[PDB]
From a paper:
We describe the development of a biologic that takes advantage of the proximity of the N-terminus of bound ACE2 to the three-fold symmetry axis of the spike protein to create an ultrapotent, trivalent ACE2 entry antagonist. Therefore, we sought trimeric scaffolds to fuse three ACE2 moieties and leverage the inherent symmetry of the spike trimer to maximize avidity. Thus, we determined a trimeric antagonist fused to the N-terminus of ACE2 would require a short peptide linker and would be less likely to form inter-spike interactions. The collagen VIII trimerization domain is significantly larger than the collagen XVIII domain (44.7 kDa and 19.3 kDa, respectively), but more importantly, previous studies reported that collagen VIII melts at ~45 °C66, whereas the collagen XVIII domain melts at ~85 °C (vide infra). Given these observations, the smaller, more thermally stable collagen XVIII trimerization domain was advanced to develop the trimeric antagonist.
Next, variable lengths of glycine-serine peptide linkers (0, 1, 3, 5, 18 amino acids) were tested to bridge the trimerization domain and ACE2 domains. To simplify the nomenclature, we refer to these constructs as TXA, where ‘T’ indicates the collagen XVIII trimerization domain, ‘X’ refers to the number of residues in the linker, and ‘A’ refers to ACE2. Analysis of the other complexes, both with longer (5 and 18 amino acids) and shorter (“zero” amino acids) linker lengths, was conducted to better understand the role of the linker with respect to the symmetry of the trimeric antagonist. Notably, we did not observe discernible density for the collagen XVIII trimerization domains of the longer linker length constructs (T5A or T18A), whereas we did observe clear density connecting the trimerization domain and ACE2 in the zero-linker length, T0A. Further, although the axis of symmetry through the modeled trimerization domain of T0A was nearly parallel to the spike C3 symmetry axis, it was off-center. We then attempted to evaluate the ‘symmetry of interaction’ between our ACE2 constructs with spike protein (T0A-S, T3A-S, T5A-S, and T18A-S; where S is the SARS-CoV-2 spike HexaPro protein) by likening the C3 symmetry to an equilateral triangle with all sides being equal length and a corresponding standard deviation between these lengths of zero (s.d. = 0). Thus, we calculated lengths (distances) and corresponding standard deviations between the Cα atoms of equivalent residues in the RBDs of the spike protein (residue D428; as determined by Fan et al.) and in each of the ACE2 domains (residue N137; arbitrarily determined residue on ACE2) (red and black dashed lines, respectively).
Residue numbers in the entry:
A (entry chain E), B (entry chain C), C (entry chain A): -37 to 614
The structure:
């Protein structure tokens, strides 16, 4: 049968009424706070533990209520800052500048108030993974952990380094009044002009007037960040940046900050045979252009890698082309013939996104964002940016033209937007990518998919009569290797160098003695002229001098290769990975959106495991993508020396 | 999520149907006497304690029937005994005396038989608190816990000192044939005559005469009082008295015997600053009367306190009046001018009770009680006493004359009788107050309200143009302090003295030395002639000789002040507490009657908490009542020593 | 007041909704499997034991199914086994001999297999007393708890002594070929011939041929009987037998094996004065018969008691009759006067058994059982046995003749089967007596009632004119004392002797000497010829050699006395207890049937309490039964010295 639970006022009433209480009927005493079970000819007291007072809101619940209230206020405040940011970037005016000051101060003050209001909430007793992740992402004091003077000094130094890099100007000895900046002056000169002396001077002059100036600033920046990290229970500032990839609280998915370093080391070792052959071929081709400036046995000059830091070897493609008479993959004729426009490019990207199974895109983007150049009466930023303004607002700000590149950037910005629309369901704190290499990877794979000849043929960009030969595939593989695989050692060595310089393993009087020697050995990049310790060459880059973790580029490339291979596997495509296309593949879009919606609500390991199939960052897709390149690279370097000599330098 | 509790005969159908049992459904098994909770994929055995036997034809019902039978027979027997007592009080004749002997013997024999017949009824298996308390009162064997000879000699000694106290006579040394009794000779001598010689001689001669013949008797009485208290599971006879205040088995209101001791001590310690100032002023007035008989730092003489044992300082109010030029408040002259008798005393008094919300009081009292001296045909005792005969019969014995003081006494007696009929619904055992300080407090609270000029003005006793300035307020407050507050230290020390005299910590050769040390240090009064252990001065009081608890008076004062303050708070009175009146406030009467009807069934702490809100003892209303007096005493004691010194004595 | 149980998926929802949970409503969460009770201002956690993995198949269910399956099949196998034994017992034939050989083999193998199956059903987790008790009987391995060789040799030694006792023959020295078996060649000559020499020679020869031969066999039998007793968790084989009387787990009726020894000793000690008077008078009559062979103070001869073991003094009733001239009570000649046979004896037995109120029994037993020897064509056994063949089949083996002795044994036999089918509702294992001293007691009590002169007169066995004087009552009482009370000391001591023989307290070189020492001090009987430890006189008993506990007879005597006293109390018998008759008393049969139906399921101590009113056994009925004889023995002991002497011997 079935029985209920009885309750009376006094124990005397319980005794007088327990006679008619059937067996199995629980008796609860409000006066005595006791529990009894009606047994045969009696009632047995049920043991009860210590009194537990009613919590109006547990400490976990108090954090939940605070986080919800903060997120609700953050959505409006961030949207106001985002729209003010949009207005400034559409038109740069004095009124536009001042509302950055107001929005920035208001957002920072609100963030500081909530972070202080969140710091008392303990993360140990909260078992809610989403709530704990929100609190730790909100409790990051950062520079505020130190004193006011120390925090202000660090911010002022950081602004100084950014200002020096941005306004770094070099004047030629022939005309001291004539001076040029790094961009677009030094970058274009060292990417197109083939003069060794001009490139060498610009490389040396910039690293002199920037390195010498930044050397005390970067050194004080390093120590201030290191001491801030110590105050934040971090071994160094590199450990602070690796904390984004750090995962805790999830069984089977925990990731430590040291695991990221060892995976980067392991992946670089895997790419080392492929990069060595790529470097050897690029080295060999430079003798074909300049036989009396570089030696095949030695390394390659930093300024002769197509840029100053050796970031991109794409500028060396004209100097390293295997078959210059073979035309590259370019469909610019289709643009002019059919009068293609930027709005049409985005419309085709949306249509392609519909084809791959992903849903449509909001019309508020079209009515609030510009694609072409917005006339000339106003100044607008033409840099490719995708905007997540919050509360459903998604925009893109760039002077998009009608070039294959722009068609890829449009796809890239759509890929950024798709991520922004995807984790939008997650709370404001969790309404972002799991790490800094996910949002860029989605845009990159979208650009890679949009650049495939099959996708162009499907939408008519590529002529149906176009043929696919070995030379075109080899040149495309080399071009991708220079652009992406070429920058992998650059990201690998720069982030590594920043790691032990923050760890304090590099003595001050030997800084450049390590970087320039390590550059020659691990990567085989050699400085054209010697630099003493007064130089600050590693900090001459934008990201390092602007408080940016450079491990994003290596992680995003590792993710983008894994995503592309996983999409190809889900799209049952037949053919080489470089020719693989995800067009008309609903499996690819659905699989991609499975991790896209997660954002940072789940650990990045779970997001990665969702598509490729594992939490590791193995470069197997990279080897498979460039296996025909690797065999061709081995064929080209079958007689050419492979590797690099640490001893050799251009000045020696 | 809703469920209940299931049951089954045995474990065979239990585990054959546990699969069909939904999760969260509690299960009781009669065969195994076990409890289980159906959890997700399992069941957890609920811990069960020993089975409590169900109520049956046990001692519970047998005692309840015995209690009902006892109450029925005690109602008639007590009615007959109280009828005989009133008749003897109305008419003192030889036939009335024989009635007392017969009624007293039968009542005592009946009580002891009920006590014996309830002795083998244990309370361990009885859970009814009302029955438990009633049967405990029945099981109050008393001195019969010892041998009969010990009880007989203790009663014989008690009657010896009580008779000696009544007949205690001192003779003038020059006139031996003329002797003055304590009642009313010595009392009147120290109440009216201010002569130091006469008061000292009467004080010394009485204590010597009483002490030299009662000291061995008091010692044996104390030893015997210790003997049957130890046999009654008490450390002394003090714990035997404190058992009435002790509360057990009631959650949130349990009281210990030592708790009242510490509460009384703490209340006196905070009272001490007010008492020291009052003692300072009375000492200052003693300098005004007899400059050479009181020291500025010394303690007051024992015989110069206005009464016999220094209890009440009302007789000193004439010599210690704050302003003797101000005439005292007295409506007796107006009352006699209005042709009002003792019948009008109770008639206007009954108007007061129906004014405060208390209902009409039965006409049986009016036809069964006298308000005047019944001439000289039948001798009547004029002592104030209220009688609850039973069966709805209620009487009050007092020679109520047409005076202001008898008006208060008439107010007190019917305050007793109104408490008597308040808990008439309670059984015979429960027909009593929770302690000995409640009935007197009830008769005191409304007496003070009646003595207030507002009540006299409302009933026409006082002229509407009566002036109430600060001088008459201070005089009234000081008179109240002398009559009530002045005796509070004496009540505390004497009860404390009698408490340790039962405990035996103070040796029999130090009873008088400790008594005078307490008198000097606590009371601030020093004897005019030193007394050795031959003197038995504490036993010279009526209460000590007749075995009467003295903590009842101090507790009653604390009770009456708390009761009055709550009544004033309930009546929404604004102004000084001494001017507070409860007339035309029906809420106060109804609220007061809520615990008056409760009787002694509930703990006295619960009753005190219900009245004001303080579960424990408090003296907060004392400060509110005498705040103008305390400020006046502090103002007037700036030029005089505050406190006392034990070193000084009138004899040294 | 009523309430229920509430559930929540997670504790977060529980905390939010705990405010809406009324007091008395239980809160359960499946995530933590935690139970809480809603209390005043909070929730109290309910203590829960370890979570079981839903064991829907308990051992209790499996054991109950196994027991029911076993009982159903065991009934058939035992039934056909009982048929074959009855066929052999009614017709001894070679084909019959192999019938029990096959039937016993199958039954034994079946029993050991079910015992083996019950071995994996431990009793700790079984809560049903009936299931636990039945499986305990099933799990009784007995001889198979040891190794096979120990069991095989124990059986072989058991067979050897059983054969030796059966074939125990002694030959006269003058006639080597003239030899007499113990039954009936030896027993007849000693019980009929009173010659001291012939009885002494037969006693000596029997103990020389059998005692010497069985001494090593008995010692080896005892050693092995101690071996599996400790393997069965018993300190000795005596404790193994005492385990049947042990009651465990029954609160208020638990019995221990040691308690049986203490109570048996206590009963014997208080019985001793009555036995000493009987032994003194029997000795006194022995000097009357043989003055030069028995001392007035010494113990009785072993061979001069009517039994070579000294069991029964019934053969001495003629030699020790209180009055040899008064005729004895016997109505056998009246049966042949009325032309009665064994059929009429049983028919009258049923009429008596239905006059006591118990229902008539079926006709199957009458047509399936013989009451007379089946001629001489087929050989049959005439020993008094009861056949509990099962399946509602009950039979009696008796060659009943038309005699009072056969009349009483016929009453004894039908009482046995009337006990058997009374508890037919019990399962096959529980279809047995509570102890070994109950089945014989049931047949004894009413057979004595049938033998009462009132019963004989009621149904016409004895003429109504028969006079009932004290002389016949004393003669009847003495015969009862010789047959029943006389065997009590021998029964108690021999079981006491065999108990410590298994225990090993008395060494092997003292057993028989301790027996004879106990025969003198306790039994009061002395051996006529001294022997050595080669003699094994206690092992000459049938029960010792055939592995039968001897405590059954002493317990049955006190059990039957208690049963008879309760029968007389229920029948409200007035006068001497030996003349009490239960005939024509329906209430007495109903009270007996209250435990007859109970069977062995309940503890025998509870059954004894239900009959009389005492949980423990007592000798009170013995005093009431033999009070006239006890006074007669006391009066006639003017020359009969109370007790005996250990020093005197027939040979010394």
């Amino acid at each position: 049968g079935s029985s209920g639970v009885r309750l009376w006022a006094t124990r005397q009433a319980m005794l007088g009424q327990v006679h008619e209480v059937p067996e199995g009927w629980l008796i609860f005493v409000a006066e005595q706070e006791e529990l009894y079970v009606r047994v045969q000819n009696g009632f047995r007291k049920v043991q009860l533990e210590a009194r537990t007072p009613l919590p109006r809101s547990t400490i976990e619940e108090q954090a939940k209520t605070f986080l919800d209230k903060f997120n609700h206020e953050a959505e409006d405040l961030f949207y106001q800052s985002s729209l003010a940011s949009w207005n400034y970037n559409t038109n740069i005016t004095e009124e536009n500048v001042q509302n950055m000051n107001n929005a920035g101060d208001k957002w920072s003050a609100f963030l500081k108030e909530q972070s202080t209001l969140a710091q008392m909430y303990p993360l140990q007793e909260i078992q809610n993974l989403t709530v704990k992740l929100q609190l730790q992402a909100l409790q990051q004091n950062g520079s505020s952990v130190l004193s006011e003077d120390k925090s202000k000094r660090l911010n002022t130094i950081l602004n100084t380094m950014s200002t020096i890099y941005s306004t770094g100007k070099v004047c030629n000895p022939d005309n001291p009044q004539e001076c040029l900046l790094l961009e677009p002056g030094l970058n274009e000169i060292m990417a197109n002009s083939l003069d060794y002396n001009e490139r060498l001077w610009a490389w040396e002059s910039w690293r002199s007037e920037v390195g010498k100036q930044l050397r005390p600033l970067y050194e004080e920046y390093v120590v201030l960040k290191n001491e801030m990290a110590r105050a934040n229970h971090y071994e160094d500032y590199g450990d602070y940046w690796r904390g984004d990839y750090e995962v805790n609280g999830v069984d089977g998915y925990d990731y430590s900050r040291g695991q990221l370093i060892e995976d980067v080391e392991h992946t670089f070792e895997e790419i080392k045979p492929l990069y060595e052959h790529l470097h050897a071929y690029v080295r060999a081709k430079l003798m074909n252009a300049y036989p009396s400036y570089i030696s095949p046995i030695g390394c390659l000059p930093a300024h002769l890698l197509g840029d100053m830091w050796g970031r991109f070897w794409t500028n060396l493609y004209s100097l390293t082309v295997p078959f210059g008479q073979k035309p590259n993959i370019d469909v610019t004729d289709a643009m002019v013939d059919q009068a293609w426009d930027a709005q049409r490019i985005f419309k085709e990207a949306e249509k392609f996104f519909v084809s791959v199974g992903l849903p449509n895109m909001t019309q508020g983007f079209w009515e609030n964002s510009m694609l072409t150049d917005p006339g000339n009466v106003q100044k607008a930023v033409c840099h490719p940016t995708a905007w997540d303004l919050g509360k459903g607002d998604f925009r893109i700000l760039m002077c998009t033209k009608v070039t294959m590149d722009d068609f890829l950037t449009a796809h890239h910005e759509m890929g950024h937007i798709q991520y922004d629309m995807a984790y939008a369901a997650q709370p404001f704190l969790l309404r972002n990518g799991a790490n800094e290499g996910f949002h860029e990877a989605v845009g990159e794979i979208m650009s890679l998919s949009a650049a495939t000849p099959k996708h162009l043929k499907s939408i008519g960009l590529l002529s149906p009569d176009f043929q696919e030969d070995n030379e075109t595939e080899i040149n495309f593989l080399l071009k991708q290797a220079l652009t992406i695989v070429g920058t992998l050692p650059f990201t690998y060595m720069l982030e590594k160098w920043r790691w032990m310089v923050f760890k304090g393993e590099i003595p001050k009087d030997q800084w450049m003695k390590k970087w320039w020697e390590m550059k020659r050995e691990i990567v085989g990049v050699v400085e054209p002229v010697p630099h003493d310790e007064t130089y600050c060459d590693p900090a001459s880059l934008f990201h390092v001098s602007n408080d940016y973790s450079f491990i994003r580029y290596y992680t995003r490339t590792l993710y983008q290769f894994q995503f592309q291979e996983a999409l190809c596997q889900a799209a049952k495509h037949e053919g080489p990975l470089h020719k693989c296309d995800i067009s008309n593949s609903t499996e690819a879009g659905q699989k991609l959106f499975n991790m896209l919606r997660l954002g940072k609500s789940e650990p990045w390991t779970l997001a990665l495991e969702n598509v490729v199939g594992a939490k590791n960052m193995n470069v197997r897709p990279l080897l498979n993508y460039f296996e025909p390149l690797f065999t061709w690279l081995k064929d080209q370097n079958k007689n050419s020396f492979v590797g690099w000599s640490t001893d050799w330098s251009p000045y020696a």
